[PDB]
mmCIF file of N, CA and C in Angstrom:
data_model
loop_
_atom_site.group_PDB
_atom_site.id
_atom_site.type_symbol
_atom_site.label_atom_id
_atom_site.label_comp_id
_atom_site.label_asym_id
_atom_site.label_seq_id
_atom_site.Cartn_x
_atom_site.Cartn_y
_atom_site.Cartn_z
ATOM 1 N N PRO A 26 9.375 -85.221 -132.440
ATOM 2 C CA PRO A 26 8.173 -85.765 -131.706
ATOM 3 C C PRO A 26 8.151 -85.246 -130.282
ATOM 4 N N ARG A 27 7.233 -84.314 -129.878
ATOM 5 C CA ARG A 27 7.369 -83.657 -128.579
ATOM 6 C C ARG A 27 7.025 -84.607 -127.401
ATOM 7 N N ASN A 28 7.836 -84.574 -126.353
ATOM 8 C CA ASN A 28 7.634 -85.394 -125.114
ATOM 9 C C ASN A 28 8.085 -84.625 -123.946
ATOM 10 N N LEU A 29 7.015 -84.095 -123.172
ATOM 11 C CA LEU A 29 7.278 -83.260 -122.002
ATOM 12 C C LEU A 29 7.909 -84.123 -120.841
ATOM 13 N N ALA A 30 7.779 -85.411 -120.878
ATOM 14 C CA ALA A 30 8.480 -86.270 -119.897
ATOM 15 C C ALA A 30 9.908 -86.207 -120.004
ATOM 16 N N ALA A 31 10.456 -85.793 -121.106
ATOM 17 C CA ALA A 31 11.854 -85.630 -121.295
ATOM 18 C C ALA A 31 12.198 -84.000 -121.077
ATOM 19 N N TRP A 32 11.384 -83.367 -120.471
ATOM 20 C CA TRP A 32 11.642 -82.001 -120.103
ATOM 21 C C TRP A 32 11.905 -81.926 -118.458
ATOM 22 N N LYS A 33 13.069 -81.369 -118.097
ATOM 23 C CA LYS A 33 13.327 -81.339 -116.770
ATOM 24 C C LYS A 33 13.256 -79.755 -116.325
ATOM 25 N N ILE A 34 12.489 -79.335 -115.306
ATOM 26 C CA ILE A 34 12.341 -77.983 -114.863
ATOM 27 C C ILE A 34 12.652 -77.853 -113.352
ATOM 28 N N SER A 35 13.143 -76.560 -113.069
ATOM 29 C CA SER A 35 13.228 -76.161 -111.722
ATOM 30 C C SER A 35 12.845 -74.710 -111.513
ATOM 31 N N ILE A 36 12.374 -74.321 -110.294
ATOM 32 C CA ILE A 36 12.233 -72.879 -109.946
ATOM 33 C C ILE A 36 13.318 -72.469 -108.928
ATOM 34 N N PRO A 37 14.396 -72.138 -109.448
ATOM 35 C CA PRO A 37 15.579 -71.832 -108.451
ATOM 36 C C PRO A 37 15.445 -70.643 -107.637
ATOM 37 N N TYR A 38 14.641 -69.621 -108.019
ATOM 38 C CA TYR A 38 14.420 -68.405 -107.217
ATOM 39 C C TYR A 38 13.244 -67.657 -107.763
ATOM 40 N N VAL A 39 12.877 -66.633 -106.840
ATOM 41 C CA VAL A 39 11.783 -65.636 -107.283
ATOM 42 C C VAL A 39 12.531 -64.408 -107.708
ATOM 43 N N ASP A 40 11.939 -63.811 -108.716
ATOM 44 C CA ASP A 40 12.503 -62.590 -109.155
ATOM 45 C C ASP A 40 11.593 -61.536 -109.337
ATOM 46 N N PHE A 41 11.774 -60.329 -109.887
ATOM 47 C CA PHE A 41 10.759 -59.345 -110.225
ATOM 48 C C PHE A 41 10.657 -58.813 -111.765
ATOM 49 N N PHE A 42 9.501 -58.531 -112.270
ATOM 50 C CA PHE A 42 9.382 -58.081 -113.603
ATOM 51 C C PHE A 42 8.731 -56.686 -113.637
ATOM 52 N N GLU A 43 8.468 -56.169 -114.949
ATOM 53 C CA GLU A 43 7.849 -54.995 -115.157
ATOM 54 C C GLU A 43 8.619 -53.758 -114.421
ATOM 55 N N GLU A 44 10.850 -53.545 -111.976
ATOM 56 C CA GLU A 44 10.957 -54.121 -110.544
ATOM 57 C C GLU A 44 9.684 -53.696 -109.845
ATOM 58 N N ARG A 45 8.568 -54.382 -110.121
ATOM 59 C CA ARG A 45 7.250 -54.098 -109.601
ATOM 60 C C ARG A 45 6.477 -55.356 -109.072
ATOM 61 N N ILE A 46 6.241 -56.286 -110.112
ATOM 62 C CA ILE A 46 5.473 -57.593 -109.889
ATOM 63 C C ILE A 46 6.383 -58.795 -109.639
ATOM 64 N N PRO A 47 6.256 -59.532 -108.475
ATOM 65 C CA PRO A 47 7.047 -60.781 -108.348
ATOM 66 C C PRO A 47 6.622 -61.978 -109.145
ATOM 67 N N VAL A 48 7.724 -62.807 -109.560
ATOM 68 C CA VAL A 48 7.495 -63.804 -110.436
ATOM 69 C C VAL A 48 8.397 -65.008 -110.143
ATOM 70 N N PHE A 49 7.921 -66.109 -110.455
ATOM 71 C CA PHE A 49 8.756 -67.386 -110.362
ATOM 72 C C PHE A 49 9.551 -67.548 -111.483
ATOM 73 N N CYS A 50 10.839 -67.626 -111.451
ATOM 74 C CA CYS A 50 11.690 -67.951 -112.586
ATOM 75 C C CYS A 50 11.789 -69.464 -112.759
ATOM 76 N N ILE A 51 11.421 -69.879 -113.941
ATOM 77 C CA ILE A 51 11.322 -71.350 -114.168
ATOM 78 C C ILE A 51 12.556 -71.740 -115.226
ATOM 79 N N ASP A 52 13.449 -72.447 -114.690
ATOM 80 C CA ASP A 52 14.561 -72.990 -115.621
ATOM 81 C C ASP A 52 14.002 -74.237 -116.318
ATOM 82 N N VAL A 53 14.124 -74.284 -117.716
ATOM 83 C CA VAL A 53 13.593 -75.373 -118.420
ATOM 84 C C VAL A 53 14.826 -75.938 -119.167
ATOM 85 N N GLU A 54 14.874 -77.387 -119.215
ATOM 86 C CA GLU A 54 15.815 -78.201 -119.914
ATOM 87 C C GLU A 54 14.895 -79.089 -120.724
ATOM 88 N N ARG A 55 15.230 -79.187 -122.160
ATOM 89 C CA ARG A 55 14.476 -79.999 -123.023
ATOM 90 C C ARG A 55 15.403 -81.093 -123.661
ATOM 91 N N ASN A 56 15.004 -82.326 -123.303
ATOM 92 C CA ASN A 56 16.005 -83.672 -123.618
ATOM 93 C C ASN A 56 15.140 -84.412 -124.641
ATOM 94 N N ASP A 57 14.176 -84.010 -125.339
ATOM 95 C CA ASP A 57 13.512 -84.854 -126.275
ATOM 96 C C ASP A 57 14.035 -84.745 -127.792
ATOM 97 N N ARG A 58 15.452 -84.309 -127.747
ATOM 98 C CA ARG A 58 16.046 -84.079 -129.034
ATOM 99 C C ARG A 58 17.597 -84.354 -129.008
ATOM 100 N N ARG A 59 18.392 -84.007 -130.062
ATOM 101 C CA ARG A 59 19.741 -83.948 -129.865
ATOM 102 C C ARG A 59 20.314 -85.348 -129.886
ATOM 103 N N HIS A 60 25.441 -82.967 -129.189
ATOM 104 C CA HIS A 60 25.413 -83.407 -127.780
ATOM 105 C C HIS A 60 24.386 -82.636 -126.826
ATOM 106 N N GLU A 61 24.753 -81.449 -126.394
ATOM 107 C CA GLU A 61 24.063 -80.668 -125.346
ATOM 108 C C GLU A 61 22.650 -80.366 -125.705
ATOM 109 N N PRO A 62 21.789 -80.388 -124.820
ATOM 110 C CA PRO A 62 20.322 -80.255 -124.975
ATOM 111 C C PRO A 62 19.859 -78.635 -124.936
ATOM 112 N N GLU A 63 18.641 -78.454 -125.170
ATOM 113 C CA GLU A 63 18.131 -77.076 -125.356
ATOM 114 C C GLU A 63 17.643 -76.493 -123.789
ATOM 115 N N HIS A 64 18.020 -75.223 -123.545
ATOM 116 C CA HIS A 64 17.591 -74.843 -122.251
ATOM 117 C C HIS A 64 17.246 -73.192 -122.254
ATOM 118 N N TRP A 65 16.455 -72.840 -121.346
ATOM 119 C CA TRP A 65 15.922 -71.419 -121.279
ATOM 120 C C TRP A 65 15.366 -71.097 -119.925
ATOM 121 N N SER A 66 14.773 -69.955 -119.711
ATOM 122 C CA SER A 66 14.221 -69.589 -118.581
ATOM 123 C C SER A 66 12.815 -68.878 -118.835
ATOM 124 N N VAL A 67 11.800 -69.103 -118.086
ATOM 125 C CA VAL A 67 10.509 -68.371 -118.198
ATOM 126 C C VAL A 67 10.246 -67.840 -116.803
ATOM 127 N N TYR A 68 9.389 -66.880 -116.853
ATOM 128 C CA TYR A 68 8.872 -66.051 -115.673
ATOM 129 C C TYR A 68 7.423 -66.116 -115.584
ATOM 130 N N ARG A 69 6.886 -66.733 -114.589
ATOM 131 C CA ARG A 69 5.438 -66.795 -114.385
ATOM 132 C C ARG A 69 4.959 -66.209 -113.080
ATOM 133 N N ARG A 70 3.830 -65.452 -113.118
ATOM 134 C CA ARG A 70 3.157 -64.995 -111.907
ATOM 135 C C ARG A 70 2.432 -66.037 -111.176
ATOM 136 N N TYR A 71 2.230 -65.759 -109.896
ATOM 137 C CA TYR A 71 1.645 -66.711 -108.989
ATOM 138 C C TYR A 71 0.246 -67.002 -109.536
ATOM 139 N N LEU A 72 -0.429 -66.016 -110.063
ATOM 140 C CA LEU A 72 -1.820 -66.335 -110.546
ATOM 141 C C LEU A 72 -1.971 -67.127 -111.916
ATOM 142 N N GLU A 73 -0.881 -67.152 -112.586
ATOM 143 C CA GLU A 73 -0.822 -67.924 -113.876
ATOM 144 C C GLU A 73 -0.806 -69.334 -113.611
ATOM 145 N N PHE A 74 -0.287 -69.913 -112.542
ATOM 146 C CA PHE A 74 -0.255 -71.328 -112.150
ATOM 147 C C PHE A 74 -1.759 -71.827 -112.008
ATOM 148 N N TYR A 75 -2.442 -70.906 -111.249
ATOM 149 C CA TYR A 75 -3.927 -71.284 -110.993
ATOM 150 C C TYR A 75 -4.694 -71.386 -112.240
ATOM 151 N N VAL A 76 -4.492 -70.443 -113.216
ATOM 152 C CA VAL A 76 -5.118 -70.488 -114.623
ATOM 153 C C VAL A 76 -4.657 -71.895 -115.267
ATOM 154 N N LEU A 77 -3.449 -72.167 -115.275
ATOM 155 C CA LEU A 77 -2.942 -73.297 -115.850
ATOM 156 C C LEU A 77 -3.680 -74.674 -115.308
ATOM 157 N N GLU A 78 -3.769 -74.611 -113.999
ATOM 158 C CA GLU A 78 -4.381 -75.696 -113.365
ATOM 159 C C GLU A 78 -5.732 -75.797 -113.800
ATOM 160 N N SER A 79 -6.567 -74.644 -113.795
ATOM 161 C CA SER A 79 -7.991 -74.491 -114.166
ATOM 162 C C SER A 79 -8.132 -75.121 -115.491
ATOM 163 N N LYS A 80 -7.248 -74.662 -116.544
ATOM 164 C CA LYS A 80 -7.299 -74.953 -117.963
ATOM 165 C C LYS A 80 -6.961 -76.347 -118.240
ATOM 166 N N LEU A 81 -5.953 -76.823 -117.512
ATOM 167 C CA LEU A 81 -5.642 -78.218 -117.644
ATOM 168 C C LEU A 81 -6.645 -79.227 -117.298
ATOM 169 N N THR A 82 -7.161 -78.948 -116.106
ATOM 170 C CA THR A 82 -8.250 -79.920 -115.586
ATOM 171 C C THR A 82 -9.491 -79.862 -116.396
ATOM 172 N N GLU A 83 -9.827 -78.691 -116.920
ATOM 173 C CA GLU A 83 -11.032 -78.513 -117.764
ATOM 174 C C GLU A 83 -10.837 -79.456 -118.969
ATOM 175 N N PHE A 84 -9.653 -79.509 -119.576
ATOM 176 C CA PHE A 84 -9.422 -80.251 -120.827
ATOM 177 C C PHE A 84 -9.184 -81.799 -120.470
ATOM 178 N N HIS A 85 -8.351 -82.049 -119.554
ATOM 179 C CA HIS A 85 -7.808 -83.362 -119.314
ATOM 180 C C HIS A 85 -8.646 -84.017 -118.028
ATOM 181 N N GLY A 86 -9.284 -83.249 -117.167
ATOM 182 C CA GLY A 86 -9.809 -83.757 -115.990
ATOM 183 C C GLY A 86 -8.833 -83.654 -114.948
ATOM 184 N N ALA A 87 -9.293 -83.986 -113.690
ATOM 185 C CA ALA A 87 -8.467 -83.667 -112.460
ATOM 186 C C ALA A 87 -7.221 -84.625 -112.403
ATOM 187 N N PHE A 88 -6.064 -84.085 -111.672
ATOM 188 C CA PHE A 88 -5.037 -84.901 -111.392
ATOM 189 C C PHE A 88 -4.818 -85.006 -109.861
ATOM 190 N N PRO A 89 -5.125 -86.260 -109.332
ATOM 191 C CA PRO A 89 -5.164 -86.373 -107.945
ATOM 192 C C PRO A 89 -3.846 -86.071 -107.314
ATOM 193 N N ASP A 90 -2.781 -86.520 -107.826
ATOM 194 C CA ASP A 90 -1.463 -86.394 -107.383
ATOM 195 C C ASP A 90 -0.642 -85.212 -107.524
ATOM 196 N N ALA A 91 -1.372 -84.200 -108.312
ATOM 197 C CA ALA A 91 -0.718 -82.942 -108.640
ATOM 198 C C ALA A 91 -1.883 -81.719 -108.394
ATOM 199 N N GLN A 92 -1.833 -81.221 -107.214
ATOM 200 C CA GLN A 92 -2.800 -80.121 -106.906
ATOM 201 C C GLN A 92 -2.139 -79.035 -106.300
ATOM 202 N N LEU A 93 -2.470 -77.880 -106.875
ATOM 203 C CA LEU A 93 -1.891 -76.673 -106.171
ATOM 204 C C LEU A 93 -2.691 -76.448 -104.838
ATOM 205 N N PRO A 94 -1.897 -75.876 -103.948
ATOM 206 C CA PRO A 94 -2.697 -75.485 -102.699
ATOM 207 C C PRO A 94 -3.565 -74.453 -102.831
ATOM 208 N N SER A 95 -4.541 -74.074 -101.840
ATOM 209 C CA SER A 95 -5.584 -72.969 -102.029
ATOM 210 C C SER A 95 -4.970 -71.778 -102.474
ATOM 211 N N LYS A 96 -5.621 -70.959 -103.398
ATOM 212 C CA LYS A 96 -5.107 -69.699 -103.718
ATOM 213 C C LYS A 96 -5.399 -68.714 -102.583
ATOM 214 N N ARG A 97 -4.399 -67.920 -102.216
ATOM 215 C CA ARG A 97 -4.518 -66.841 -101.338
ATOM 216 C C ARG A 97 -5.569 -65.933 -101.666
ATOM 217 N N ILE A 98 -6.597 -65.724 -100.993
ATOM 218 C CA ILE A 98 -7.707 -64.717 -101.288
ATOM 219 C C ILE A 98 -7.481 -63.464 -100.431
ATOM 220 N N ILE A 99 -7.245 -63.671 -99.149
ATOM 221 C CA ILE A 99 -6.932 -62.556 -98.249
ATOM 222 C C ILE A 99 -5.388 -62.449 -97.854
ATOM 223 N N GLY A 100 -4.751 -61.460 -98.088
ATOM 224 C CA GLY A 100 -3.451 -61.131 -97.915
ATOM 225 C C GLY A 100 -2.590 -60.859 -99.193
ATOM 226 N N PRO A 101 -1.375 -60.484 -99.029
ATOM 227 C CA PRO A 101 -0.530 -59.918 -100.074
ATOM 228 C C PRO A 101 0.220 -61.201 -100.866
ATOM 229 N N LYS A 102 0.352 -61.087 -101.973
ATOM 230 C CA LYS A 102 1.144 -61.972 -102.786
ATOM 231 C C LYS A 102 2.406 -61.430 -103.131
ATOM 232 N N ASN A 103 3.236 -61.145 -102.055
ATOM 233 C CA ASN A 103 4.556 -60.386 -102.139
ATOM 234 C C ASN A 103 5.648 -61.354 -102.360
ATOM 235 N N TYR A 104 6.843 -60.840 -102.297
ATOM 236 C CA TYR A 104 8.134 -61.687 -102.440
ATOM 237 C C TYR A 104 8.134 -62.889 -101.447
ATOM 238 N N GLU A 105 8.015 -62.672 -100.163
ATOM 239 C CA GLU A 105 8.176 -63.608 -99.219
ATOM 240 C C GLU A 105 7.091 -64.624 -99.232
ATOM 241 N N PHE A 106 5.854 -64.405 -99.644
ATOM 242 C CA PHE A 106 4.943 -65.385 -99.987
ATOM 243 C C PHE A 106 5.161 -66.175 -101.200
ATOM 244 N N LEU A 107 5.593 -65.622 -102.231
ATOM 245 C CA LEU A 107 6.006 -66.445 -103.430
ATOM 246 C C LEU A 107 7.286 -67.346 -102.988
ATOM 247 N N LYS A 108 8.183 -66.857 -102.388
ATOM 248 C CA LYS A 108 9.233 -67.548 -101.815
ATOM 249 C C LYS A 108 8.846 -68.811 -101.007
ATOM 250 N N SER A 109 7.819 -68.704 -100.254
ATOM 251 C CA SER A 109 7.332 -69.731 -99.357
ATOM 252 C C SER A 109 6.655 -70.915 -100.252
ATOM 253 N N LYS A 110 6.195 -70.491 -101.361
ATOM 254 C CA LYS A 110 5.397 -71.482 -102.232
ATOM 255 C C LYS A 110 6.393 -72.043 -103.297
ATOM 256 N N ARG A 111 7.703 -71.562 -103.543
ATOM 257 C CA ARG A 111 8.495 -72.120 -104.639
ATOM 258 C C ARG A 111 8.559 -73.633 -104.736
ATOM 259 N N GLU A 112 8.854 -74.228 -103.633
ATOM 260 C CA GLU A 112 9.037 -75.663 -103.683
ATOM 261 C C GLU A 112 7.828 -76.465 -103.899
ATOM 262 N N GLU A 113 6.639 -76.174 -103.501
ATOM 263 C CA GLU A 113 5.372 -76.865 -103.771
ATOM 264 C C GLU A 113 5.088 -76.575 -105.433
ATOM 265 N N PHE A 114 5.370 -75.367 -105.821
ATOM 266 C CA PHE A 114 5.076 -75.056 -107.189
ATOM 267 C C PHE A 114 6.043 -75.750 -108.111
ATOM 268 N N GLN A 115 7.240 -75.918 -107.805
ATOM 269 C CA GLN A 115 8.261 -76.640 -108.444
ATOM 270 C C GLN A 115 7.825 -78.105 -108.570
ATOM 271 N N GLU A 116 7.408 -78.665 -107.501
ATOM 272 C CA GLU A 116 6.943 -80.082 -107.447
ATOM 273 C C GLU A 116 5.728 -80.317 -108.317
ATOM 274 N N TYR A 117 4.804 -79.387 -108.143
ATOM 275 C CA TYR A 117 3.569 -79.399 -108.954
ATOM 276 C C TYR A 117 3.801 -79.619 -110.458
ATOM 277 N N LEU A 118 4.630 -78.708 -111.028
ATOM 278 C CA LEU A 118 5.091 -78.764 -112.344
ATOM 279 C C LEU A 118 5.892 -80.094 -112.794
ATOM 280 N N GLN A 119 6.653 -80.560 -111.923
ATOM 281 C CA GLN A 119 7.399 -81.729 -112.188
ATOM 282 C C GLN A 119 6.546 -83.000 -112.285
ATOM 283 N N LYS A 120 5.691 -82.923 -111.338
ATOM 284 C CA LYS A 120 4.740 -84.197 -111.379
ATOM 285 C C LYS A 120 3.834 -84.154 -112.780
ATOM 286 N N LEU A 121 3.326 -82.826 -113.212
ATOM 287 C CA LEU A 121 2.731 -82.742 -114.397
ATOM 288 C C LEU A 121 3.376 -83.323 -115.662
ATOM 289 N N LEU A 122 4.657 -83.032 -115.592
ATOM 290 C CA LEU A 122 5.521 -83.419 -116.823
ATOM 291 C C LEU A 122 5.542 -84.920 -116.972
ATOM 292 N N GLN A 123 5.281 -85.682 -115.783
ATOM 293 C CA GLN A 123 5.410 -87.102 -115.857
ATOM 294 C C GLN A 123 4.109 -87.840 -116.325
ATOM 295 N N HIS A 124 3.051 -86.905 -116.201
ATOM 296 C CA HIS A 124 1.678 -87.578 -116.635
ATOM 297 C C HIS A 124 1.718 -87.955 -118.198
ATOM 298 N N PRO A 125 1.524 -89.124 -118.537
ATOM 299 C CA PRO A 125 1.419 -89.486 -120.003
ATOM 300 C C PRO A 125 0.358 -88.647 -120.714
ATOM 301 N N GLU A 126 -0.784 -88.299 -120.094
ATOM 302 C CA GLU A 126 -1.722 -87.586 -120.706
ATOM 303 C C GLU A 126 -1.341 -86.198 -121.142
ATOM 304 N N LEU A 127 -0.237 -85.661 -120.611
ATOM 305 C CA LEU A 127 0.273 -84.311 -120.860
ATOM 306 C C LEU A 127 1.555 -84.351 -121.638
ATOM 307 N N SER A 128 2.008 -85.470 -122.063
ATOM 308 C CA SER A 128 3.360 -85.446 -122.788
ATOM 309 C C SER A 128 3.483 -84.663 -124.061
ATOM 310 N N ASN A 129 2.198 -84.407 -124.643
ATOM 311 C CA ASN A 129 2.110 -83.351 -125.816
ATOM 312 C C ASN A 129 1.085 -82.323 -125.432
ATOM 313 N N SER A 130 1.038 -81.812 -124.257
ATOM 314 C CA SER A 130 0.178 -80.747 -123.901
ATOM 315 C C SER A 130 0.535 -79.369 -124.359
ATOM 316 N N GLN A 131 -0.251 -78.656 -125.228
ATOM 317 C CA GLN A 131 0.034 -77.402 -125.612
ATOM 318 C C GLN A 131 0.154 -76.365 -124.548
ATOM 319 N N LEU A 132 -0.906 -76.481 -123.752
ATOM 320 C CA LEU A 132 -1.024 -75.593 -122.480
ATOM 321 C C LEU A 132 0.248 -75.625 -121.729
ATOM 322 N N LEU A 133 0.772 -76.880 -121.425
ATOM 323 C CA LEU A 133 1.940 -77.000 -120.521
ATOM 324 C C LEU A 133 3.328 -76.464 -121.272
ATOM 325 N N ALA A 134 3.297 -76.800 -122.536
ATOM 326 C CA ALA A 134 4.424 -76.439 -123.398
ATOM 327 C C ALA A 134 4.382 -74.857 -123.415
ATOM 328 N N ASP A 135 3.294 -74.258 -123.696
ATOM 329 C CA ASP A 135 3.079 -72.747 -123.763
ATOM 330 C C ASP A 135 3.515 -72.120 -122.466
ATOM 331 N N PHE A 136 3.043 -72.731 -121.400
ATOM 332 C CA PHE A 136 3.364 -72.181 -120.074
ATOM 333 C C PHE A 136 4.929 -72.297 -119.712
ATOM 334 N N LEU A 137 5.584 -73.413 -120.253
ATOM 335 C CA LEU A 137 7.130 -73.546 -120.116
ATOM 336 C C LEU A 137 7.918 -73.065 -121.230
ATOM 337 N N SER A 138 7.319 -72.061 -122.041
ATOM 338 C CA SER A 138 8.012 -71.718 -123.262
ATOM 339 C C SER A 138 8.057 -70.150 -123.107
ATOM 340 N N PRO A 139 9.146 -69.498 -123.643
ATOM 341 C CA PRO A 139 9.259 -68.050 -123.494
ATOM 342 C C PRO A 139 8.326 -67.281 -124.312
ATOM 343 N N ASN A 140 8.010 -65.953 -123.805
ATOM 344 C CA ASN A 140 7.191 -65.008 -124.598
ATOM 345 C C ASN A 140 5.686 -65.445 -124.724
ATOM 346 N N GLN A 141 -2.440 -65.324 -122.237
ATOM 347 C CA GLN A 141 -2.517 -66.642 -122.298
ATOM 348 C C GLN A 141 -2.960 -67.284 -120.964
ATOM 349 N N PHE A 142 -2.343 -66.923 -119.893
ATOM 350 C CA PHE A 142 -2.644 -67.284 -118.582
ATOM 351 C C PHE A 142 -3.006 -66.117 -117.663
ATOM 352 N N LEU A 143 -3.721 -65.157 -118.213
ATOM 353 C CA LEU A 143 -4.316 -64.105 -117.396
ATOM 354 C C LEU A 143 -5.713 -64.453 -117.023
#
């Protein structure tokens, strides 16, 4: 029985994919089963977070306590800028996981599962 509140995540660093596009590396731990629990990593682009927020809020309505900051329209989304947003983005996801409304969210699960948000 899926329960995202029993999933712990962190974004320990920013990496590169394709070494061309910068991405957040999201470590996931899944504790809604099992001694040792399940764990993996996922790589998400800056823009994918905004699509997640758009899609979640469309389906579930807004979350006052969990808001992404304004999307950068003018300027580069390079390594140092992703690095500057790491902690905010980590906190955003962690708060989402504790919303009862999202404890069985397919969007959030897909977002936090390896291998949609374009």
